[PDB]
């Protein structure tokens, strides 16, 4: 054998003397083969959930996942059931589909999984520091407690006329509408809905100063910060290219603006309750006694607005697109508007919004068929055992939960692919805890997360903007419905979703034709 141990040696030297043709050829075929072999070996573990097969190492199933994630999920579900892992741009994602999925990931022990470990690389470049996913979970919990303290029923009662004012101003002044000079037109909902979202959100959460700056060049900074919030930040987070530093410019620029306004409200004492900025100023002292720096506060503002911008605008687009081919639902929604607002002689209020169940059902149903975030991740911190199986999810893996996939399942939603607001009759609540509650720092929320309809997640990371979004979407749709009818151009229909972005947007252009319900109606106020 010693004459073979000489030969491993010899053979080794001859490898180092291959032409660079075969050397490069080998540095690609050696890893390709080991990859394929490791998988076959992997499939013989019985404490591991089935791993989706793939050819290209590191990249894994990222193509099909990234492009059509629900269909990926469905085919995986058919060959392996509800638990399966797949590889994604260097990471291993264990997907648990269905309500026990929600349970296993949303109700995971703090010690078992990390949300900030998963998200901070995407969000921190964008929002700034010391906030959201750039702090310990405990801090997050109190930050949510803060924000949510400006998301009160009385807050909502002041925001509603402000939001309405913005919609009306938008109809009057935007080149997309100009209702005072045109009775009909075509809009890209993907153009209109983002401006409407930022305008209304800005004016209400950030106040009238901050809204006004959007009428200037300053608005482009929101657009710059916007582009840095993209999945590419997951694999290539900081690359010395130009989109990355207009991003960082904007983060600095916008944050500075808030601090400018923050500090000068304190150097006066223009501290009321008008907006979230007032609120966070009066209310951002942690339980251990620390106060949020002005910088942190501002970064928390950026985060809050960013999160409500994309989800809400997408939902707003989808509502318009689904209704554009359902003049019966527009008709139904309009009658409810007339009955609740007494033919329009009542002014819209947060209270009156709550008495529009069909309106809220449309929001509800849209959020069902078009959940904004098709995937939520965690990273596993301790080996997790999955009941009732032999599976251990080893630390360093990622768990992926996808309530939006469950939303589109016939098992839990009869005719799941049919837009039907009436599947929610006598049931228009944004959401409700259907049993016992629990509190993590920002208020009592559902303890069980087994509801097959989970648009806002659950557990410690559960959303806190649900009521803001229904408020915004409510006022928005109330006014669209009372002002306009709208339909598709010839042979157009509901676009299919673009899953590749951070949010599941419709595939643009998604155009609708509007026409005034009342051609001779003039929106008041003044423009130049
Ligand atoms: C249609 C609108 C929205 C939908 C469908 C939605 C959905 C969600 C979901 C699924 C989560 C949980 C994320 C996870 O567990 O990994 C979440 C979290 C959160 N959302 Fe929303 N959201 C919406 C709007 C908003 C708005 C308007 C705001 C703020 C004004 C907001 C702020 C937040 C915050 C602060 C969290 C906490 C995240 C954490 O603790 O990790 N969201 N949202
Ligand atoms: O970062 C994320 C986020 C990151 C992901 F990788 C996936 C989904 C996400 N979903 C949300 N949102 C949930 N509601 C609104 N946005 N946020 C997020 C969470 C909290 C805040 Cl303040 C802002 C954002 Cl964008």
Residue numbers in the entry: 8 to 535
Report text from the authors:
Lanosterol 14α-demethylase (CYP51 or Erg11p in yeast and some fungal pathogens; sterol 14α-demethylase in fungal phytopathogens) is the primary target of the imidazole and triazole (azole) antifungal drugs, often referred to as demethylase inhibitors (DMIs). The CYP51 enzymes of fungal pathogens and yeast use eburicol or lanosterol as substrates to produce ergosterol while their orthologues in plants and humans use obtusifoliol and lanosterol, respectively, to produce plant sterols and cholesterol.
FQZ binds unambiguously in the active site via a coordinate bond between the N3 of the triazole ring and the iron of the heme cofactor. The dichlorophenyl ring binds deep in the active site adjacent to G310 in a similar manner to FLC. Again we observed 8.3 fold (3.3 ± 0.7 μM) and 4 fold (1.6 ± 0.5 μM) reduction in susceptibility to FQZ in the Y140F and Y140H mutant strains respectively.
